[model samples]
Target chain A: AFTSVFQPGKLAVEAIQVDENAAPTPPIPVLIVAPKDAGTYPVAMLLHGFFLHNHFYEHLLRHVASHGFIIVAPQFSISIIPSGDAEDIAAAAKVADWLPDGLPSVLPKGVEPELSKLALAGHSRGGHTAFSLALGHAKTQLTFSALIGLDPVAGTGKSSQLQPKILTYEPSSFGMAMPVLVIGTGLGEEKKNIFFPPCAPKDVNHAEFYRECRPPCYYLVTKDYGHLDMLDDDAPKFITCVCKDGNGCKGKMRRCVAGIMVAFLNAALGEKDADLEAILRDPAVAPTTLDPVEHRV
Target chain B: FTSVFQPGKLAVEAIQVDENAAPTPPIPVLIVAPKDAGTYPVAMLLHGFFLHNHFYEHLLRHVASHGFIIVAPQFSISIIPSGDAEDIAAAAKVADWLPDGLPSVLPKGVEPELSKLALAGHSRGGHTAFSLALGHAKTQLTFSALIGLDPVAGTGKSSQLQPKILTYEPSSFGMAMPVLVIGTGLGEEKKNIFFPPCAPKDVNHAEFYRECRPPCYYLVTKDYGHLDMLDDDAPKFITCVCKDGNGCKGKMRRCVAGIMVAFLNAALGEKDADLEAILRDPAVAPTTLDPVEHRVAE
Candidate 1:
């Protein structure tokens, strides 16, 4: 029964963003993926990979939003170069602080976010941002009930850890009060060619991030996918071409991630574990091939 | 769990070309097609009276993912009201430019099978599609299939608009291609007393369907409203006036695209199946089957 979560949810979802130059803009211009219906749902604040626009993950965001979660995907950095760790970490806090008052006004009429059960999530470098916020790398006004990292990368190439180093080279060091879910891609650590660096390198990849997370966490890695495989097909070629993606269906990989997120959110925020338990009990229920899954309690 | 209703085997890329692009295109277009290199059939989808082509991003992409190229064009230059006559001519001009002009803008290694073209439009644009297919405005190539999505004939009146394509007679259209007229059961319902029904009674999808010849399909997504087939986040100003259905949301949009793909397959000889599958078993639908009706050309 939980397998149907991989398919598009029954909810009709809407993607919204305020024009950058529009008079009176949002706290931090965001691409909000929310169910169009009038019910309030838990929020999963999604941060984009480095040099990636928030809209690049529209399909993935909409998939999650359709499953009854409000996705606040924000473009924390507008950099053409790799130089915004500290700035982005701080920007994430600002956006979280503004959500309570500003998000409702911007979302589709009748849709609301349950801030009390907020979840913070990020992909690629954005994953690093989520962990930073959770680890108190940057102070936030609100508390997060859960955290998620989609192929999170802390540094480039061989730089195991970056500034405001959240990684301590120790096991189970995430010490946050909330539960965590880390989804990794098997091919994310492999470079497309000798000329390009792996998008999610070995030392600073999802594996290490998971190892350092506290108890009550889940780690599931897709066996045939890449760092940006979960992004919309319309994502910039220059960015996607560099990542080494497996031949397996990218859509399959994408749906699996969204489905897993929904299950995890349901378990943590809404106190429903049937979907999560079903997937964890039998990894084959997932849409894509998953390597050995680790569920630490 | 219909295959065509879900994302297809191929990945799709969506690119926008301005009206001023090389070859002086007749109008701006948002091209959605398989990102994987291959020749594919084309669908020229026209936007409604007050809507832009980009409003159908998700809808266009859904059908494109299933292996056809969708060229959704923004015909009108401004939002201010204009005659349907100009829109019909502009649409005709784009069709004529398809073979030569579209090739230049298409993704590398992707060619359009213009010979297997399909003409489609929504609301007032549907009337334009009927007009174009009827030769109200001439084009270099011909369409093999036509689709009218919750089509309406006039501005909420009993009479037809200028250059009216309807004959007010049963099975009277001269269209040689297969026709699919998708109606929204709630289309004729008003959201408020001040505004008239978006798809008014006598001059709506029912009238258009009644006039179509054999080899046609009529399916009304019973609970959906007139604008339900549009993008989830479609521009909300004019869309707010239209009423939407309940319970399973977004099912109508997928049904519209999926049904179109199946019809395209049967009409263009791309392959075999789905339109027949639905006709055979209405229970396979993502939402309520509403009422499915079709006629076989003898």
Candidate 2:
């Protein structure tokens, strides 16, 4: 049933450190996943969840790259909180800034990387940080073509009384000027006292954040899913206590996240495809795991 | 020493919709306000990591009973120990939105005095409330006072994100109001699972008391654990391993609520001689155990 997009596309992945003094922070490491075919492709900058390094999300990145997109995941500060939003944004922007001069030599002969189009995606707090970049909370020259939040936790403009944190984007204070898609887990609404609720509180879930999004936004909630289901590894050693098993729950949550991400990015940035259109138009066309909700300005 | 305002019934409600944005589900805030009130001081209660606003309902209700309007916002699952800055920011946003009033959730007739405001939280949430008063230029509202229930300065990698903990420099240099830091003596004891005694001294309440500027009060309950300050039923879900300490849950909660009520009353212009007396003499609260340490600057 998932055959249309599940075929294995030829891909090449590499880990490299881009040396740049112009950036605010030291040169950080990034994993580059790209198609083997010799042609330019859209660039997607992916960020990891709290206390999670970039390596844990390799499967998600590789799957997106297989669909004719170049994916780059940077290993920012290992701590749950980033050094600051400005520094994190600079690191992500530096990868985009260094693309022209940095990857030409490392890539195989005749393979050109696209430097024009850019997209941002992140999980948890990183998801909030990504929205911050799109909302102009951080100084970035690159214009994001689209934004994807994988169950992001911090936006939604709920923090009206306090000052803006290093990684906060009050949805009420700012609106998304670009196309956006927020994927949430239904289990997030469960009582926190329970063992390992996937989502934070309802106010901080993707549903709330998506509602505040200015138009051209999509909201999808995957029922019966856990927070760590997006990660590739079967057993996440770091968070064994709270993380739930995705494999036991029919094993389609990760594929759904990756497939929908590719579809949305393609329609938003590349030539429009009918398959993606149908999936977006009708929930039945999409995977059963995805519960597509209403969307409007 | 405790009697000031007559105890009153509390009206509690949960608000679902975000007033500022359409369709966005704002974190449901639990509003606990006194049924009888001209215009009472406002207080914001924040929950710790992996915990929601409901867990603190009892504590908030107790404060409301003492003639105040308390609003507790259910923040995100901030457990990693590094997202206090963001959590505190969320609490601030709720405070800013409170004046507009939650149509369905807030009682029909009760009004909250925006000018008289206080912030209180437990564990990581406590750190967030403290940060709001740190005088950041972006802070929109000035809190008259702050109450921290065993406010945790995280250790290990978690402490790296806390500037105050990392540098051991006073975060109160920008303070414009008085603050109360409550600690459990058992929390200071070594080998506790929630807070290892081996953690850097600055990462706990001791350093906060030492470094915070004058007009700050530090209260220590000698026989309680870190999580004891939470609701009496919290220990049923959360684990706090303590040795040689009184693990009485209900007693600790009462003491904490009583101390906080007195502190907020005095700090927010209530000017009750009895409340101030409780602050000066822990013996005033008979339920509290012996060896309570109370210190005040100015």
Candidate 3:
């Protein structure tokens, strides 16, 4: 059971090994942070940024956990190219098998995980992986209720100038059955960008991802945040140093991102009928720093 | 209860500091050191991919119990070649901060003897530790010794799986201090479905031992898996399968701790005869199912 709205739930770490017959690799390690009570909870499968592991996202994931959802961040081998992206998506889907059993032993006795209501969330290339899963690539048995992309970079074209020979996604395959929310750091799309070349390219930015995503898809762009600011402040210096915008607002940016994500996940996965529009529109809930905008087809 | 194990009480503390010139927030580190009064040698313990400093708590404490200060930092999960320089640099920060004495974390009277320094790690961390000692000009910290527990240099087809930037080529000069290369036999056995030998022969311990200058030691144990070196009790997932049979985990942990203590003592000037004898006699490591093959540099 959750203690309060503002405080995070007591969390436990578990390393769920991938079944030898299934993946023939070590178990995917995940930190399972959930409310301590006896009620079964909705599950959120969180993926890490490109080359970044799950440990660095402790605060963000814990915030999600604090909101009464079970958070599972799978650590996978990171790659920037298309093939690596495919492998990550495949690995992310495989984590579905470890549910209930994959959870830590500290959960309230008799309570099980609600697999039917599952949400996928990721950062950077991981965001691209989430989009890939939602598009029916290597679909998992568990139903995906919603998809959240934290500055997903995989899409077609490089600002009409340079394009990946192997496209991560075809622009036509944008429609997803579930509600979608794609968050972008304005710094990435602006002319003065830090994640240039590999990321923040014109064609692969949030606008590109949202343009392709069908109705029910929402896009939020933060004026001050950078590609890596949403992550914990302790991440590698190169990542944070790349962008100067929103540098001072890292803590606020994370809180704003967490508030938006929790509201969206609750509406999509929890039984409570959340007023997502109201939440997004409210200044206190969405914060002024995030110049959030919405689109529905 | 074990006679070979030391009786020192261990104090573990976690601290975050922006030591390395890295522009990000302070790096988090887990320090396990003896609670007593004397300054001890320092050893940096690096964790494997997707794992953090806490994952190696037992190993760090075990080493600390043996009278050495163990500092483990949480590097990013991404080990891709592009991020190698940054990860190595972050690790170097922990090493650099050690000499000044970790202010808040250390006991008032005790400190780490900056001069008597060593580096050790598992899997990808082992590679970083090796890279640090490889003496890249940017790395100003010098180690007196190094211990690699199943350092992974990914298989030939997937050489990209590892950081290709720091290749341990034959011509690449070796470390100035003694080195210990510990490997498991299970990764090589075809019957073991998990951890198939993706790491080419040259990139792993085999190549590390061969390339390192004399005074290097190589020890390969049969019936152990790669992740076995990690102290955490791995779930019964396919990735944790040990075809070498049951109880392999306990055995592997004990063997690793014993071997590491022995090597660090010998190389760091402790010169314990019993520790040296343990290094020489495979029987001392009863947990290891097969005879341990060990060799020292000429």
Candidate 4:
């Protein structure tokens, strides 16, 4: 029996669908994926990439949830105005503050959340907001214990950066007191063509975000993958045509990312690292070829 | 003399220097020292293989709290580690720059007492420190003292690094300055299949101390692992497998910092009382002193 976090987990998953913005419901629309069983699990608030829908991470969220965790991905903005961290940080915190009261009442019939073990994770621009919330750019009642950034971008370039001033340009210098896992893509900073800007530009990208982090952090880069490689295969074609992509299978990158998240979350939230240490010892155990793998304390 | 292990009278301030932003230094560094307005003695600390200088925030702060300016340079983060020759050359360059470059960056009105400079390191960093002190890499200023926190000689299984320090000879070290070699008993013990013993037998702290001349202090805490002296939140994923002692968390770090302070005081300053007391009575140490050796004669 070959078991890997990259593959579907042993536990079956369930979904939480809400009209979300419909008056009586929570203001922030969320698509939750959790185990169908009766065990309490750590809640990970997965923030989606800029202008991306919560359902965009359906596969990624389910893959992580199957490993016995709950992923509550929220849609902070549908039509992005390049408003940056100014409001997104507060909005993400508001969603986080509402989790304890609003989420418990609406969770699965038997499943529960150990709010004490909450983690914040994001992709692309969402990763920037995730860092903002975790770093007290906007404070929340629930303190985050861990953070994950996938191809996160704080701005387009040095001259055109976003709010929160997260990247200090200094190495390994993030001031947050939480475990961190930053996944960078090799092609995220590359231009698709002469007319396009790189989706995840250099200096303001995952490398620096992870660079600014203090230890007990994980950093991995899929050598051939791109900024949008972790998104669901059917993610909006309109967005896909702009950025450079990997020549390999998108699902391979997707599965590798989800599995890496599970490994990091397992160690970060639960403090059980058999799976993490395994992958760390040998990156080849995962589906994709993970280059530049580093685990620092 | 004040107890060297506890937080000293000086309040600490840590400064981060970006590699590209800073004009003086050749590489990025974390400078930890006193917040009080005054000149202070200097100590240069180097990181273990693949470790970031930020990881030493706690240890350096602990030592800095005792009134030493600690400058830890982040040397190499290359996927494939650079050669020892490359590391020593960079470290030497940093050492050469320190005399003129360090003061402008310190706290306002505070100054650096470079004359009392001490060189120190941990793991491969320790090896680097020894290499610098032993003339493997030349420096502009001669260091006043040297310290090694579980120094390692090479990758245990593979090609031994250049300018090998271990000659299988005892008390043969040529470093004229007073030396301190602090070690963990479990540093040489294997962790898991993927990771090797952090400090291998022939090429570890044992070899460093064994080769040291007199005016040296060798101390080993039997219960701790090689990385025990790192911060409370030192990267745990990699550290977890280091065969740590139960209930001995953070204790070794305080003890390590305390001893480093004690050693620095005796070697770099006029005060030798606290160090003498520790040598006379090991109980004053923060943790278990499995073996304490002091050699005053060459």
- Which candidate wins on TM-score? 1
Candidates in order have lDDT scores of 0.80, 0.62, 0.63, 0.79
Kindly give the stretch of ten consecutive residues in candidate 1 chain B with the minimal lDDT sum: B231-240
RMSD to truth, every model:
8.0, 19.5, 20.9, 19.7
Candidate 1 lDDT by residue in tens digits, A1-297: 546677667787877885554334655678878788898888879888877888778767877877788888777657435454877887778888878877777778998788887999999888888899888868989999999899898886445466656877699988898899999999888888779887887778799899999998899999888888777654545457689967755657777888888888888987888888888889899978889688999
How do the residues B188-221 of candidate 4 rate in per-residue lDDT, one tens digit apiece?
8887667778888888767788889889888998
Model 3, span A68-129: residue lDDT tens = 67777877864455454777777787776556455534345644677778888888777777
Candidate 3 lDDT tens digits, B1-298: 2344332344433344434433332467767666665878888888766666765655665567677877788887565543456667778876766655463456666777767888887777777777778764343456788888877655542463334523555424456778777887655444445445523455666676666666766777676766655543222232343334334354466577768877887777756564567656667675552434344544
DockQ of each two-chain model: 0.08, 0.01, 0.01, 0.02
DockQ score, prediction 2? 0.01
Worst 10 residues of 2 chain B by lDDT: B232-241
- Candidate 2 pairs with clashing backbones: A159-B93, A160-B93, A161-B92, A161-B93, A162-B92, A162-B93, A188-A199, B215-B297
Once fitted onto the true fold, the runs of candidate 4 whose alpha carbons sit more than 4 angstroms away are A1-297, B78-82, B156-159
| Residue-level lDDT for A119 in candidate 3 | 87
TM-score of every prediction relative to native: 0.65, 0.45, 0.48, 0.55
Q: Give the candidates in order of DockQ, highest first.
A: 1, 4, 3, 2
- Model 1: runs farther than 4 Å from truth? A1-46, A50-52, A56-125, A133-297, B77-82, B192-195, B235-238, B270-272
